[PDB]
Amino acid sequence: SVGWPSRLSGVRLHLVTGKGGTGKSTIAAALALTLAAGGRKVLLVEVEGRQGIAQLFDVPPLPYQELKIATAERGGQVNALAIDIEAAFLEYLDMFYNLGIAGRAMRRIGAVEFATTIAPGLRDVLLTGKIKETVVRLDKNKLPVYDAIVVDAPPTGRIARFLDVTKAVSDLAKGGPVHAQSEGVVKLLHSNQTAIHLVTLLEALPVQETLEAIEELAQMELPIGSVIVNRNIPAHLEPQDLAKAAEGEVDADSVRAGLLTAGVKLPDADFAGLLTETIQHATRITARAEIAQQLDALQVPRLELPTVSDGVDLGSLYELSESLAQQGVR
């Protein structure tokens, strides 16, 4: 029943997945705001080089630096990290192989771009490796720098492979320190310190991808958090009236009667039009409920977010953060 069991409050790494266009970026930002409230410090991470955080906050492209992007309720802070895969590869070459010289030569000929494109496993190793670094980082007092890390993650069709450390490591050079680090990544990912959240719309393909992704991840023994149902709409109709209206039956007499009380008399062509509008609404809610029912089989907590009327802006992220907090997200 609860959309956020208490165990989810002990999670340090939140991965926000879901089909393309379902709300990952928006929801990951709203989640970060929710977790930062009350003097906390949360990192919002993106891994695909798409600059979705900059686009969402309507600012120029962010550099490879953890920077304050938002103020949360009661002195909380949200930092942003748009991972630059090229700078991450040079950082890796320098730290684990002392190849900073070779790396800076490669950047000048586009060879870092080539290498990350032709070796997808190296890409995931650098990305998941950086994610782990922000999670386990400590201050001078041996306390975590961040209270939580929220990853605006790859979509449902790619999330299981992105988190497949064994498969990513498979096509990398044997021996060295990269294999010792990967053990730490696996431990972190397969623990009570991580949770994968799945954003969905009440549409056929986003729901099918949600179910399919949960099954791949459960098989991988990766921890599932919540299913977040985005852009909910009001039914505005009672269950019996709705079920009837989805069949074309609307009680005109009862509608004509209630319109008299409200001081409204409608012509026949406009009254008929008003009735088919409610039939069309009822048909949409019914179809959405049939789609939603497919998620009932999952013994997974579920959260519901409303539809923002106009373009999602800064104020909208705070409304969605507030909606999450009301459902017990903390």
Binding site: H236, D251, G258, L259, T261, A262, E277, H281
Partner: peptide, 14 residues
């Protein structure tokens, strides 16, 4: 009744 108000709310939303 209360159906007529919801019917009016559907229309206004549309």
């Amino acid at each position: 009744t209360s159906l007529a108000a919801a019917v009016l709310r559907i229309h206004a939303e549309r």
